[PDB]
């Protein structure tokens, strides 16, 4: 998908310590723009991107009401699920919910999704057609029949194919300078001798957006995947991302190795080499 | 923009 809007909900029961934790975040592609934290002081949906701050009072009252409705629904879900699995309210349990939509290059609906997990495991999920459910076990079959009787899928579909896409389009325009930008990776290479015979070549990619990127090492033009160390793409803390890849090369054979960077901001892939000196 | 509709598990 070209662009996406996603909402993430986490609910964590706290035995002996009061109300359950509830944390909700909304993303436009790889950019968080709203948050809600049950332990936060404001008890309102808060902005985390500059373009959503231009929204007026009714927007924020509406989002606050919707996220509090999700918060209170999750509070009931924790008890219901414990009832399904016969659990004695003495342990901490986790509920996670994720829904949203993707749009194509023409900003029109491509796919929608609604996922629900209990204790880090799939519980019930809306199928790609947005019409039926995939239930993971016998407890999810109870949820499925209830949601089928209440026509939950038909009403989630209207949001996922409709409202979700419409407000994604609005966000992409109002926040075009953040959301529609491409920051090509700033790339450099470092050299770290591990002995008199071997050395590590580390290929860097920094300050890039979006997070999707590919780093591959080649030797004589052949892929060296089974010998490349890759850290997962990590956030820099300022809206950009980082990544590096390293290979251990024999001292004297560094010129045989090349690092290739692929990114949306690069029209053609970049080739990096290590120049002794 | 969140969904105004939500149903219990």
């Amino acid at each position, epitope marked *: 998908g070209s662009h996406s809007m996603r909402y993430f909900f986490t609910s964590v029961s706290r035995p002996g310590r009061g109300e359950p934790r509830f944390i909700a975040v909304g993303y436009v592609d790889d950019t968080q723009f709203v948050r809600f934290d049950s332990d936060a002081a404001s008890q309102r949906m808060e902005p985390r991107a500059p373009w959503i701050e231009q929204e007026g009072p*009714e927007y924020w009252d*509406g989002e606050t*009401r*919707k996220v509090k*409705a999700h918060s209170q629904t999750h509070r*009931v879900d924790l008890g219901t699920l414990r009832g399904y699995y016969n659990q004695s309210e003495a342990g901490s349990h986790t509920v996670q919910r994720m829904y949203g939509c993707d749009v194509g290059s023409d900003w029109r609906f491509l796919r929608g999704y609604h996922q629900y997990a209990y204790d880090g495991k799939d519980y019930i999920a809306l199928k790609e057609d947005l019409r039926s459910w995939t239930a993971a076990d016998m407890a999810a079959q109870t949820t499925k029949h209830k949601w089928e009787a209440a026509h939950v899928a038909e009403q989630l579909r209207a949001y996922l194919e409709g409202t979700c896409v419409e407000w994604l389009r609005r966000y992409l325009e109002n926040g075009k300078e953040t959301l529609q930008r491409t920051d090509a990776p700033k790339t450099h290479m470092t050299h770290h001798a591990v002995s008199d015979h071997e050395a590590t070549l580390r290929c860097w990619a920094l300050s890039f957006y979006p997070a999707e990127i590919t780093l591959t090492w080649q030797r004589d033009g052949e892929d060296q995947t089974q010998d490349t160390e890759l850290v997962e793409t990590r956030p820099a803390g300022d809206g950009t991302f980082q990544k590096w890849a390293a290979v251990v090369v024999p001292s004297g054979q560094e010129q045989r190795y090349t690092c290739h960077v692929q990114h949306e901001g690069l029209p053609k892939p970049l080739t990096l080499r290590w120049e002794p000196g | 923009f969140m969904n105004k509709f939500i149903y219990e598990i």
Partner: antibody
Amino acid sequence: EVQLVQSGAEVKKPGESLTISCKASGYSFPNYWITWVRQMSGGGLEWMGRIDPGDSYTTYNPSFQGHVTISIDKSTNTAYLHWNSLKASDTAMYYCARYYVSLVDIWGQGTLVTVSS
Amino acid sequence: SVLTQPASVSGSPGQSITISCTGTSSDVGGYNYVSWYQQHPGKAPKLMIYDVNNRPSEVSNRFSGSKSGNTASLTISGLQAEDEADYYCSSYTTGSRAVFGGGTKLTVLG
């Protein structure tokens, strides 16, 4: 400030058709359904049904299912309540109301209909 | 009907009265979404208290709301003749629906 403005009172006879309307003045973010409520003389508030203005998805109360039809015109923000054939039991006050996320926050002024034979 | 209110309550002017609203664990005891509406004869319901104890700025601060378990309460302090009306409670149920109480006729003995 948004207000629901319903259509005038109706004086009807059994067997006739009827359609009462409810136009929401001003604009609101799509966070709400439009709900129709019946209040018979001296009675409580009976939830008849509701409709989503975005996709016209309609939920009815099982007691009113099939006897009345709720529709919407999102281009004019007008909700409709239609009886195919009035039965003289339908003599009551009818309110439209806005259900905003987790709350009925505004009410229409009411449309009294009187079905006498 | 789905929620249970007393059919009638009375009070003297200047005094305080309380109207109860009893539901189940799925509406009143399950959520903090209890609403209260005032209805004068011939007129539409008007929102007085929402979200258990919240109140619109235009509604007099003589009205307050509270909840405990499966029962919510509306309290009106310093009763005035204008407070004599019908009062209805409502609660959130799942599916973003609402259930109402039966209504309570308040009489202010003037």
